[PDB]
Amino acid sequence: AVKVGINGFGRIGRNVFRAALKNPDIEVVAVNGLTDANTLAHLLKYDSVHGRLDAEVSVNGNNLVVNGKEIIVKAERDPENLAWGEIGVDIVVESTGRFTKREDAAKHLEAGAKKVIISAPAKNEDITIVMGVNQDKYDPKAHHVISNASCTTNCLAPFAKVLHEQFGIVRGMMTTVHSYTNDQRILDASHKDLRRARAAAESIIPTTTGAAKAVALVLPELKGKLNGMAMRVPTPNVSVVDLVAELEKEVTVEEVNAALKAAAEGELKGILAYSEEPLVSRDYNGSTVSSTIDALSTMVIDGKMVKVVSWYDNETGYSHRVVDLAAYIASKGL
Amino acid sequence: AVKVGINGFGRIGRNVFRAALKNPDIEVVAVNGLTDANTLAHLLKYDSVHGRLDAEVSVNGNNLVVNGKEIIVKAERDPENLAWGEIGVDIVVESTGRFTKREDAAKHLEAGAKKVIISAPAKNEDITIVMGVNQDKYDPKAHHVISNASCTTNCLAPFAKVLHEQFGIVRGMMTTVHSYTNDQRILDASHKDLRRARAAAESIIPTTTGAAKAVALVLPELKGKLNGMAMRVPTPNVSVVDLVAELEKEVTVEEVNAALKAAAEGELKGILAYSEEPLVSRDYNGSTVSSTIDALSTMVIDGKMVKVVSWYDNETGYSHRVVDLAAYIASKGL
Amino acid sequence: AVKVGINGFGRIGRNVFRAALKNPDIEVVAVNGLTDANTLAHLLKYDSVHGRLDAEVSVNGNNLVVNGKEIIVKAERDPENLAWGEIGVDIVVESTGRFTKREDAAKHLEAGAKKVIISAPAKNEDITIVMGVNQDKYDPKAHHVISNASCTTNCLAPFAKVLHEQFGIVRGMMTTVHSYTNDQRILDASHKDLRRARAAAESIIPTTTGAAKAVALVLPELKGKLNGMAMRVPTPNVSVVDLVAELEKEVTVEEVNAALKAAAEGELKGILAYSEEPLVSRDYNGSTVSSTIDALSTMVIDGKMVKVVSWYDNETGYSHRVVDLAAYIASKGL
Amino acid sequence: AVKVGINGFGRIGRNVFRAALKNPDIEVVAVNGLTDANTLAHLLKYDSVHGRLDAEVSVNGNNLVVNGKEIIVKAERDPENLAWGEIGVDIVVESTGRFTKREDAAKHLEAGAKKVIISAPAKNEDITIVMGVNQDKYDPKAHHVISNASCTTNCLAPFAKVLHEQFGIVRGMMTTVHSYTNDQRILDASHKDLRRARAAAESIIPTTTGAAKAVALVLPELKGKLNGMAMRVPTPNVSVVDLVAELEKEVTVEEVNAALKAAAEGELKGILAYSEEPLVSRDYNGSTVSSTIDALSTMVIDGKMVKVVSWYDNETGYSHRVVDLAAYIASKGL
Ligand SMILES: NC(=O)c1ccc[n+]([C@@H]2O[C@H](COP(=O)([O-])OP(=O)(O)OC[C@H]3O[C@@H](n4cnc5c(N)ncnc54)[C@H](O)[C@@H]3O)[C@@H](O)[C@H]2O)c1
């Protein structure tokens, strides 16, 4: 229904595309990339992590054709030149990684679009949303440049929401054992971050994350109560959050796991899942939820310090929330 | 001086050997595997993780020859048939992973050996020692079957001891992001642990660890205060401990780090180390210390909750401690 | 209709089961594995390479319940005590890798099975068959212990036949760049093959193969004409055969590719495949055919020497052939 | 004594530096890299593939200090502005991979350098040199812009020479099972070559190589007689050349190997090596020769079709050859 345009046809850009194909409410009519249609059609058809796309893909001139629909393929390095308005695009997904500042992201609006969803933490954005935690704070009038936050923040926020409301989080540290991303290096090569400068598939690479501090933008109550780090490991996709926290009310594994299970079956259904199976990272590849509690790993010490471990396919889960936010925004009035 | 024999020439058995070539106090006189000397020689000479052994290694008859020294090669499934006494073996490193219970390890004593060091967490052992922490508890008269604990416990106990004495741990949780071991499966196969049954090099595998609570054996004061889990990831060697503890005092990163830095250059020298460089797992391959604090990762919330991350070569560090333990015990009198 | 029993529920045994779920002509009624039903049900449901089973799996007592049908689980180490005839088993897929010699494979016949299909090269078998190549040489009266050859031979024979019938192979060499299998070690440990003894996911490991010479069994004319080797690399599944041969006729890349494409759409349809896309191994994980020509890699020098490269998912393609054989056998008259 | 400058401080640049430390004839006095002195010292100190550098590496101002010797650090995107002349730099190693046409490389000479060695195949270079094969064709007057060829070409030419001079090569094919390099993608992303566009550590990736044809540049009698392909696989370093050739003279496995062993011990000593041990790729990491014959893999069919497999550390072997070339050139007067 609502026309959408994607800027930056990379891992997130192509994954939001795949997720958007089976969504009746949105319609991607134009993509922007810094490469030819043929290369784009090839990368969309074949995926090393997600397999072949369940649709017929072809190239008509400089345009792609997916399941009969022709997709306009642009090659504008400068956002203000995209001309979204002329082709009817109401919402633009900004996933290049270059326009995270509201100043830069707003150019899409100069170009004619009505709303911009930055697929990453932003700077000066009108609002940051985490489907399931604060999408209710969205106002169609005061918010145009929106951030969907990071994949880590999307996994952590839903369950921190439940533990906090139910027992009260006093403070806590987190660690995400994350698969490698395109921001790293294949072999030792220059990087602003000396850890990420190192061969990705060869080591356990400790790095920084702002996802912990970022939860506060969606859960104000937790401001100053959380912090954490990342550890990038040799897997191509799927990551896990490991939260250790001091609760206010004394709990038991039994209690904690029931509260999460209840939320997964009720309120947060679709966003938070609950598992009592002893699965591993490969098993989570392709899951569309943002967070899945590994129930078998939940533990407590002295009734007040808990450990909760949650899985998340960083590409697929996040891509589904971008598509979800877009459909939610459209419903709010475009 | 002390003549040592090794039961089970595997990853740990072979590294204990390599570590022993160094210490002149000890002398390996025989090894027992379940294969021919030719195979043992090769595996000793070429290592996929630590490189070629720098020494003259050959096969003489059915014995190993390393830098002129003939090493006896046995192939006894039953330790009761090892006859250590015949060949004068004073101490035996039990590294098969099959005889961790007092009932099986003791067979080495029955065969003529004076002391047994179990290269793993044991059962019904006279004592469990972690060098740098409780070797002082060693009684030559009473202790004959001694456990050298696990690679993780050897990493954790040393710095936890320092945080406890200095600030007092109220309670804490840990996660060890661990390289895979021979205990896992190369491709999906049967295993007592359904997590470890999965292809080791393809996923992040949550698995339990007893190392956290096994700390109370060496630092009794900490019984019931710590707990934790493990996560096996696609790397052949080197692991990291991630400890989040609730302290009794208010501290700063500068304080916590200054404490760990003081211990490393002082009392725990050679066992505990301190690092301010932003390194990755491959950089600690070959590290002989037990624990190396990653200063750059030290974090604190409310001045009470702390995050300390420490590295350890699981094969090298651990194997050096076995050799250390063997020379200490020997010095106490055999 | 036909009742099949699988001996050894490993990588090949489980995939054969999966493939069989498709075929209604066959019906797997019993499996034998040296583990409990619960572990078999887990390993069957979650696969690190092939994903989750698209079927409802559960355990009822000591049995497997899959899609309502109850599968009998056995735990007999000795084939003699399997009593296949007691349970109606007509065909037995021998996939343990321990009974490839006639003396052991036949024990199934003696236990009541009418036919045995060995999922690997055999010794003293009645006939070695590669579907599409020589299945017509199957005499239901004379043949009871049948070998289905190796995954490699299965990949090479269908197109080696075509190149030969059309151009005539003088002599040729082949190398298969193969994924690692459960026969290798995760870390340096004992093995009869000192190459396969090394850390699987860390090196390119040359090893031997009999596939090249084994083509002679299904294509008698090529005896003494081919030979080859293997190179095990750090990928979990999917391999590729690289053939270099001298031909009788002087050809061109279009001629060679045209003949290979023709067979793909004709005689060898379903067994041999043709591809002109620039794909990679991960793209072939899941392919049911035995061989797929990477057309873009075909090369010729002097018009007489040719290079052909063919892909094969060593687990899926082979397991589909096993089920294809079981079905062809049943139809011939059991 | 011959002052050398390295243009481009990556895998080859840093490795030429390390090799250079062991050479008496040359002395690296300056390095141009598009990054700060701090980042370069870190990347030079810690290598994920070759380990820690055994030398004191520090940074004084914008310069590097390695074992008391200071190195000038530059950050010039444009070669013309490097001013090699002002600092006594005679030879310049061009290892950026950007300036391979004689036209671009020559900018170095304009900037004061006297000689340029391109660490890669070039376009219009004055001469291409494979040490041990044709360095005698170098002329100090007429050749100023020299190409050192590719790592694959340096591995193949030394033994191609021996096989040709000894038995006569009619024609042949080769495949190099090659480790990945910085030209590949961490995760599916754009690239000229759609195969190198795919996640490097996840698949067996076929690709093209001009190494076979390039042998004709240094071995003219071999023009149009060889061709081949490459296959990138999940290993960070060490590669192997698989050569299948039709010989002129009838031979035997023994003659071929005795021939390669002889060259290894004689004329090609230092360039070609001979191994009768069943090793794996990790065992060749750090190897300084250009090519090591895996003797156990030599195969012959109809006494005419041979197969030789040779190992090469694409970074170390090649880097040493660059240092040898630079020193060879220097001995010829500058
Ligand atoms: N990779 C993940 O796991 C993940 C998950 C959640 C969020 N993100 C965020 O998504 C964004 C993109 O990340 P990714 O991982 O998909 O990376 P990627 O490198 O695969 O995607 C970037 C794409 O944008 C394109 N591009 C860059 N600048 C452009 C420009 N100026 N004009 C047009 N196209 C441009 C690039 O060519 C590329 O195709 C980042 O902000 C990232 O942090 C990544």
Ligand SMILES: NC(=O)c1ccc[n+]([C@@H]2O[C@H](COP(=O)([O-])OP(=O)(O)OC[C@H]3O[C@@H](n4cnc5c(N)ncnc54)[C@H](O)[C@@H]3O)[C@@H](O)[C@H]2O)c1
């Ligand atoms: N590898 C590590 O990181 C590590 C670290 C610390 C402690 N450990 C412990 O050390 C033990 C050995 O572990 P590993 O990782 O070296 O494994 P491994 O599999 O490499 O070593 C086991 C060796 O013992 C041999 N063996 C088995 N039974 C034997 C017998 N009955 N008699 C003689 N030899 C026999 C096996 O063939 C193998 O060679 C385990 O208990 C393990 O928990 C391992």
Ligand SMILES: NC(=O)c1ccc[n+]([C@@H]2O[C@H](COP(=O)([O-])OP(=O)(O)OC[C@H]3O[C@@H](n4cnc5c(N)ncnc54)[C@H](O)[C@@H]3O)[C@@H](O)[C@H]2O)c1
């Ligand atoms: N995996 C492939 O790529 C592939 C392809 C073609 C042929 N093969 C052949 O398939 C056979 C199986 O190979 P795999 O890769 O599946 O191995 P695998 O190790 O995964 O499975 C073999 C199974 O046999 C079981 N087993 C062992 N002894 C048994 C016994 N006596 N009775 C019952 N069960 C027993 C084991 O528990 C194991 O689960 C081998 O002969 C192999 O050569 C493998």
Ligand SMILES: NC(=O)c1ccc[n+]([C@@H]2O[C@H](COP(=O)([O-])OP(=O)(O)OC[C@H]3O[C@@H](n4cnc5c(N)ncnc54)[C@H](O)[C@@H]3O)[C@@H](O)[C@H]2O)c1
């Ligand atoms: N990687 C190997 O195994 C290998 C082996 C033999 C030959 N080569 C060749 O050597 C060359 C370098 O390859 P590499 O593997 O070192 O890759 P790399 O990416 O590690 O090295 C390239 C370096 O040059 C720098 N650079 C780029 N433009 C520059 C410029 N304009 N001025 C100054 N510095 C610049 C880059 O920042 C980078 O550090 C290539 O041509 C490659 O084909 C590579």
